[PDB]
Design a binder for this molecule. Sequence first.
Ligand SMILES: Cc1cc2nc3c(=O)[nH]c(=O)nc-3n(C[C@H](O)[C@H](O)[C@H](O)COP(=O)(O)OP(=O)(O)OC[C@H]3O[C@@H](n4cnc5c(N)ncnc54)[C@H](O)[C@@H]3O)c2cc1C
Length: 500
Amino acid sequence: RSTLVHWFRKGLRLHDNPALSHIFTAANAAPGRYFVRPIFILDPGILDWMQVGANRWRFLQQTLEDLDNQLRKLNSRLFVVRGKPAEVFPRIFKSWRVEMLTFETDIEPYSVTRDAAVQKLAKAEGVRVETHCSHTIYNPELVIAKNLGKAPITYQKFLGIVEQLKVPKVLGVPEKLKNMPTPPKDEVEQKDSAAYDCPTMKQLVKRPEELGPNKFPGGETEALRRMEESLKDEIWVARFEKPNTAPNSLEPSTTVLSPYLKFGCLSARLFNQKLKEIIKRQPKHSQPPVSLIGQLMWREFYYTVAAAEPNFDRMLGNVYCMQIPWQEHPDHLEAWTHGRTGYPFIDAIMRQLRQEGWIHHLARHAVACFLTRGDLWISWEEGQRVFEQLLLDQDWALNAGNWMWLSASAFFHQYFRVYSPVAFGKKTDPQGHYIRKYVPELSKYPAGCIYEPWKASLVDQRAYGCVLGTDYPHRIVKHEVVHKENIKRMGAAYKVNREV
Ligand SMILES: Cc1cc2nc3c(=O)[nH]c(=O)nc-3n(C[C@H](O)[C@H](O)[C@H](O)COP(=O)(O)OP(=O)(O)OC[C@H]3O[C@@H](n4cnc5c(N)ncnc54)[C@H](O)[C@@H]3O)c2cc1C
């Protein structure tokens, strides 16, 4: 006999998964011919390429478990193989007599190299590789080609292109495996019958003390549930305007599908389709960019630009990225990183992020502006690194693209609009409920100065039971000074970049 292998990296789902579907249709149209091994490889390699926080490990843990459960309903299971792909594939190709290897493609530079290295080994051992582009609605390679070789650097140009592009058909779940034996133990399974079993919380989350609330359980199952719940309110869906959603409401004002899209637990293609259906039905609806489909197109846009630039996540050697003399201030960085900037609004955001691993888009704006061009004049690369560690939805392309946007390094050039770490939150949370929740030391402060505790007299501070400098830090910088400085600095950097 011989093996068919689906390799999950992203695309952690059964729905709308051409790569997995193909393996399943194949084994069913030729029964008794083939063994099926859907695998995930727990690469030690990415830990050296990427920071991963406790919260994201738990989401991946929950994601793998859900995928196991899902595959067992199809008369299969998930095989979680430990080890580096370069070491793993030689072995299993031979040890499993692998005829076909499918996977969903991915544009991240680590993926690209790892995937080419595997496609080389697969050719050498006569293994048939078929790859699918189903992580994004559009193939960035087709977008780029339609634009004569370059990625469009504006949303609207991007939209122009993708509008004249074929929407792909969305698949359903694969047909249950008909009459499949469980693959016979291999060399590794024989010495340990649990060696390909889904990791437990304990194996994956080395730092259990860093886990915040379990709010967004990983996995396809929950992604589909959460999507169904979001689309319930068709008016909210149809009329959605991203800029008008609150960053600091206590419940998320957007869908929080981002972690599910990031891992491929939800197909972006299914989501786009379901949204299309609601828009046909609802004649009064918002349009890109502010619309919900618009949000998905942002995702497509950043994937397209990122696909064309291997150094997307760094300032140096990045065709898109303004060269800016960011400064090193390790103290300021640490204070920002841990929400001890002494700006409550910023602190609350940084604290929500560390605890829960998701914050609203405009909350990300606020903190990212503060760290970079707004206040601390720290490289967006540092911000990126902390987001990468803390966000459930951390996404190489999306994280880098937005950081470049926010720091006015790329795509956005109007650096003289600066968020106020004092005023910005006030528009949507005048009572400061959000701040009370995440910065509870300040909970006794009236709304009049909860955004601005340094406005309270020392004796009122004692009264509120939080004295600035002992219970809550003084501001690490004075917004009113530094932001004016940073505009000049930005102005200078823009000029020297203009003249190269
Ligand atoms: C500094 C910074 C860093 C960011 N890092 C990430 C990241 O690592 N991963 C991530 O998924 N998003 C990132 N974003 C984009 C955006 O903030 C999040 O996608 C959004 O907050 C996720 O919440 P949601 O799913 O409720 O979004 P919704 O408003 O419900 O949007 C639905 C989906 O559309 C996509 N989307 C929405 N906004 C954007 C956007 N600005 N760019 C690209 N796609 C978008 C996401 O997949 C999101 O799930 C970042 C934004 C900023 C400003």
